[PDB]
Design a protein around this ligand. Structure first.
Ligand code: GDP
Ligand code: GDP
Ligand code: ALF
Ligand code: ALF
Ligand code: MG
Ligand code: MG
Lengths: 411, 422
């Protein structure tokens, strides 16, 4: 019997593990391994109904040819594990064990893979944990549902930009856009009188939100340009709140009779708009359509890159800013020392007595140390200590170079 | 008649202006200028009901002595401007024009100032805009209500850390904690079966969410340690959802008869909890209690700092990581060039003829450029181009230093060569 399968395992030590056996068993079966694959993912902040949504996607995938695929209104919602409570439920990445075979309007018979992910920003996860899951699901899926709550905030765009860039870094160089379809799914949209629920309201909302204009600040322009650069198709769907019973009742188990009717009405539109045979886009990587067997190889390849240390680590805004502040200050203090030493023992300056050279070096070292300390930096003085010691060590190294330059002028 | 007053203005070119005349008219009047001041602010992500909340705080401030301060159930909600719609309403910082005089259980009157702020992360603002508003409002307030939606996510704590770090950087150095009281107010809390609505469930939720353990990953540890070290008192209040009429009905105008009853009950706990005379903390800066006139002086000083450019610029995760990646690659590549040039024209090495020196320099410069370009960095090759150009420029400057070092080993080379050619 079909069920969810844990394929990306996140460990308590923040390491990642691919369950290759379970993955090979689902995607290398004879019926699917050679078919071109459509991979649908949902990702975004944790505790926002992602697994819940995926389980309605499952109902549609099993009952496409039925007018009432949304189900019996007394049927509980099953599949991927979903629940209330403040603590995360999904970890890593899970896929549905049954690969769906669908006929496109082309006549092409394609394999459809459904992928559910650990929400970002939970209380147990580093930024590297969250970015790796989100980048991997974007790199593997051909349709990425970016699940957002209520609105699209500038920090939603900055996270998307960080995660997609992290994905790009693990990918081979390419002249085409790295990714395919992205849907901004806005849950609990509260303003249907400003933009109607659904795809047409969402398209107008998103055009406004992502619009680049010349009078816009560069920081605002650049995040929008980066998002457009990454995806060949970007859509948006505004979804109503499903009712306070769905959000707050601990006995709720997914029965449609307990879900707000306007939510159901739009949910019935959203799922086929995402998953109908005409809207299923086959996965492509660097301009080649991928089969299920091909997808398995890329999954293994990408995880290995993220398991190693070839790529830089994503860092928080304060941590990354502190590091850049300190690196820039080291460079400035070191450059100051170099140019000041050139004034007293550059090539065109006379030989200096060794004791004089030492006195002037110690003075110029102290001046560069005071320059470094005086620059305002994020992170605090304790964070700076490592960079202060590096600075002093590199200046001491430079000094020995100058001892030898000076010595050459008295031979 | 009393109303909201814009005191911090964010311009469309993202510059900041203090309307000192408006501020002075309010805080320097004879009635309040010399009274110790309590400042209450609300701040957080945009479009989350901050102004709405403040107008219910206004009702309390005006009707504390009335039996039913919350208002008639048919009375619309007014004061600071609030509304639905997805676009921001409040910009900058505004204060209420009427300063409330309140007697403490001690015996003398404090002045209470209410401050409403632009939500962070709206689509028209830079990170620096958001950071400056949130920092200024934290630095000026003695009670900061941090307004959050549904949960406390790790990105919420990273933003609070960044914003409070930005405020600390603009303050006088002190051995004391820089700020006083912080309230994590969680709107639309959905799990009362796990942590009950209000301040006791909030305290248990927040104690767990903010707990510092020496065994958590340093990234999670250090955010929590930072927040704890910034505030002398941190609490948390979990508020129910107000109902879909409040959230989605365009005709809603604040009438209590259209607000869910459980939200009202907790609202009636929250507001006196925040504002009761025995709960009002007098603003302290650098160990001194502050009067209204002193608060104006600090508002002027702090904004002057953020109007200048003495401080590091707040940057997005991608922007800051890309910068750090490129800065490190530049330093490595420049260091390599220096070390390789020392092998050939260090002080203890023989004179090199200018043509050999140039050829070797050009080889080593290319190897360093190749090293820089080979480093995997966030942000793209296009982002790195400013740093590649800077590296080539700094390498060229070092080369000229080496030309002079080398020439000094044989000043007569060109002259003697010319004399020997004959
Ligand atoms: N407010 C709100 N809650 C939802 C929605 N959809 C599902 N939920 C509830 O969200 C909670 C967590 O759902 P889950 O799918 O496990 O979230 P995930 O962690 O994002 O996968 C459950 O209590 C769901 O009933 C929605 O559209 N809005
Ligand atoms: N979901 C929800 N909406 C609220 C709450 N409080 C107020 N609102 C609605 O949120 C919208 C924005 O309110 P406003 O005070 O202008 O938000 P601000 O931008 O943060 O100041 C209004 O439509 C309010 O009716 C709440 O606790 N939960
Ligand atoms: F909180 Al989750 F899937 F994002 F359980
Ligand atoms: F969006 Al606001 F006050 F944060 F109008
Ligand atoms: Mg889930
Ligand atoms: Mg407001």
């Amino acid at each position: 019997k079909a069920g969810p399968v844990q394929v990306l395992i996140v460990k308590d030590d923040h390491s990642f593990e691919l369950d290759e056996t379970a993955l090979n068993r689902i995607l290398l079966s004879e019926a699917v391994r050679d078919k071109e694959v459509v991979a649908v993912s949902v990702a975004g902040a944790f505790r926002k109904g992602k697994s819940f949504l995926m389980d309605f996607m499952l109902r549609y995938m099993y009952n496409q040819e039925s007018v009432d695929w949304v189900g019996d209104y007394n049927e509980p919602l099953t599949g991927f594990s979903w629940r209330g409570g403040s603590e995360r439920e999904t970890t890593g990445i899970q896929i549905w064990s049954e690969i769906f075979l669908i006929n496109k309007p082309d006549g092409k018979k394609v394999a459809v893979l459904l992928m559910d992910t650990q929400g970002t920003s939970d209380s147990q996860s580093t930024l590297r944990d969250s970015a790796t899951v989100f980048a991997l699901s974007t790199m593997i899926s051909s349709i990425q549902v970016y699940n957002l709550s209520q609105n699209v905030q500038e920090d939603d765009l900055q996270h998307l930009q960080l995660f997609t860039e992290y994905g790009r870094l693990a990918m081979e160089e390419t002249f085409l856009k790295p990714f395919q379809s992205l849907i901004f799914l806005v849950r609990d949209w509260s303003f249907p009188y400003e933009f109607s629920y659904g795809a047409d309201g969402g398209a107008k909302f998103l055009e406004k939100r992502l619009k680049v204009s010349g009078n816009q600040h560069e920081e605002l322009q650049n995040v929008r340009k980066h998002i457009h650069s990454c995806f060949t198709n970007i859509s948006c769907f505004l979804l109503p709140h499903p009712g306070l019973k769905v959000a707050t009742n601990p006995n709720f188990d997914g029965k449609l009779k307990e879900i707000d009717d306007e939510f159901i009405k739009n949910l019935k539109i959203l799922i086929p708009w995402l998953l109908s045979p005409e809207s299923l886009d086959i996965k492509e990587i660097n301009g080649n359509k991928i089969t299920c067997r091909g997808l398995v190889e890329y999954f293994k390849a990408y995880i290995k890159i993220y398991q190693g240390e070839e790529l830089p680590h994503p860092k928080s805004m304060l941590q990354a800013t502190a590091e850049a502040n300190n690196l820039a200050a080291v460079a400035t203090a070191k450059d100051t020392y170099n140019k000041k030493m050139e004034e007293i023992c550059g090539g065109d300056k006379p030989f200096l007595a060794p004791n004089d050279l030492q006195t002037k070096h110690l003075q110029l070292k102290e001046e560069s140390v005071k320059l470094f300390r005086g620059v305002k930096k994020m992170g605090g003085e304790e964070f700076s200590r490592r960079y202060l010691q590096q600075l002093e060590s590199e200046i001491d190294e430079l000094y020995i170079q100058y001892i030898k330059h000076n010595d050459s002028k008295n031979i």
